[PDB]
Amino acid sequence: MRIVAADTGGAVLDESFQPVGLIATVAVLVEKPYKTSKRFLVKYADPYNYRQAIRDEIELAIELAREVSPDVIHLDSTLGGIEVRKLDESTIDALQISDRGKEIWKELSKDLQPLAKKFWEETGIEIIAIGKSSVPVRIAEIYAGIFSVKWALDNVKEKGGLLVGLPRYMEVEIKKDKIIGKSLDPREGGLYGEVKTEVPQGIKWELYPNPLVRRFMVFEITSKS
Amino acid sequence: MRIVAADTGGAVLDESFQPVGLIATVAVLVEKPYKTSKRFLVKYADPYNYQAIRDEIELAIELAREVSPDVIHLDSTLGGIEVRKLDESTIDADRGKEIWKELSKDLQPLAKKFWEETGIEIIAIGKSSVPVRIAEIYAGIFSVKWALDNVKEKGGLLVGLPRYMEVEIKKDKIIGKSLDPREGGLYGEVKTEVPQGIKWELYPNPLVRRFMVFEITS
Amino acid sequence: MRIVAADTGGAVLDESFQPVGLIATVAVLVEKPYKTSKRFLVKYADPYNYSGRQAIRDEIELAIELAREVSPDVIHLDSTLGGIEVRKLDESTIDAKEIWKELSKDLQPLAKKFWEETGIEIIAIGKSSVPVRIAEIYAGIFSVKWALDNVKEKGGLLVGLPRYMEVEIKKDKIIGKSLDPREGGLYGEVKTEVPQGIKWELYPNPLVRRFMVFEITSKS
Ligand SMILES: [Mg+2]
Ligand SMILES: [Mg+2]
Ligand SMILES: [Mg+2]
């Protein structure tokens, strides 16, 4: 099975760990053995001017899918595997979720449903709201963490610093020519990602637990002085 | 403490990872340090034609008549109440209360007799029990053994393992381990014939996070 | 950020893994990089004489005591309530339960007085807090130190550890680590004299998945 998935992750935090805005939306193509992705796209938001996220996700997943022709698209909404092209107010009412959840997806339907309908009509490919059950979604999330770190390394102010809140229980490792992202949960079976980049000089970095949010890590960049 | 527990796990999957039916029910004897089992029984189902709790309680009782444990752990998370005490009244203390109210007809007296016979309680503990989890891991292990023994006649097989466990295939045995270090190093080991001219692989079920797939081909 | 947290943990188990009483209440000071604590306080309870109201009472005073020494930015209390400030804990905001209305009459004045002196909030954050988890691990460690220090001659002792943590015995030390790598490598360290004439082992509580047991047995 060949799967395209998307997710949004990585947040700029202030020095007191308060979220400021999200950084990266990533679409991935995942194939057997379903541990990583070698083909992916990134879209960067502006964290300092921050759901537009799920709109960027479905749009980016569709763009990648048009290139690689997967069997299915996985969307990060935990709905049971229902097709997005079939998401109307009635089918949402039949979903076992919160009333605000239903309210939220009724609003989103207006933008997502027509998009998935048109893509399906063109390809026969379904976009499914599978959410947290999906490994490709988790891999997308992992890549969003890596790309958020890459973004921070590329944009950190001279003599300045930057805190990036990573997606849940993942770590990044810095190499001279790339960033490696890995789930910290061995139960996931070894999910990981790698992205090439140039690591700049004059800065230090540190990965540590977000003291306010258990199982979430922070990647902090500080300037050398 | 010496414990017999039972569970059912391992599933045949189609090529699109959709489950077809369960494979193995396993009863285990577990003693200190409660990380593995050395004495165990297995009962296979017909996955292509798939109540597990009935086979679980029987296979547990069966092993118990051979090793005489202090207690039996049944896979039903009820906080530890004795099964022989499970009658419609005691049950009432929601869809679940309804289903347990059906099972209790055959199970309650079955455990009553056993307790009178042996002085051994059958407690409904489920998710809290380490022995139950050890039984589950072995069910995974035997599901792989089942797969090894059926692949030649089937050509290719996808086995869905129980949650977050891996298997490793060595010279004369299958080793299974929990992937969750929080469980404290739970593992199992089963000696078996490894047929030749096969290739196998372990990888994430892309549709079910934290579940692994054991794939074997000829 | 500098945070003082507290929690109670470590249990005495009987032969059949049944909890008897809790052992240690620990306040910890946690700073960057938020993996451990190098300054901490402990109060031992009497496990054989132990509802759970005393623990959070002992927790808040130990935290305040520690806070007066190290002056943190905030205090974390083990109670998951989204992070409400304890000094603002009365009927109207609690109602937004019957337990806390009993607790508030003691805790709220403590928090109010402390905030008045320092401006430091005591927040009911609970499980979201890393420093609370670090306090919990230290409770596990001090519980082992307690067991080592108090095991009878030719007697034994079962210590029920807090959730998914391990302890390692070293020559002059007890080390505690979380068994969940998702937490990012949280650990603790406590200096102590390890008694002779005793053996130990660490193994899964068979009745409580993901909880470990640390057992002391006397050599013969
Ligand atoms: Mg998402
Ligand atoms: Mg079961
Ligand atoms: Mg507590």
Numbering used by the authors:
A (entry chain A): 1 to 50, 55 to 229
B (entry chain C): 1 to 50, 56 to 98, 103 to 227
C (entry chain B): 1 to 50, 53 to 98, 106 to 229
Article excerpt on this structure:
Here, we report the crystal structures of PhoExo I, which shares 76% amino acid sequence identity with PfuExo I. In this study, we determined three substrate-free structures of PhoExo I and four structures of PhoExo I in complexes with ssDNAs. PhoExo I forms a trimer in solution similar to PfuExo I. The 3′-5′ exonuclease assay of PhoExo I showed that PhoExo I cleaved an ssDNA from its 3′-end at every two nucleotides, and the cleavage stopped at the third to fifth nucleotide from the 5′-end. PhoExo I is predicted to utilize a DEDE (RNase HIII)-type catalytic motif for the hydrolysis of ssDNA. PhoExo I is a novel RNase H superfamily protein.
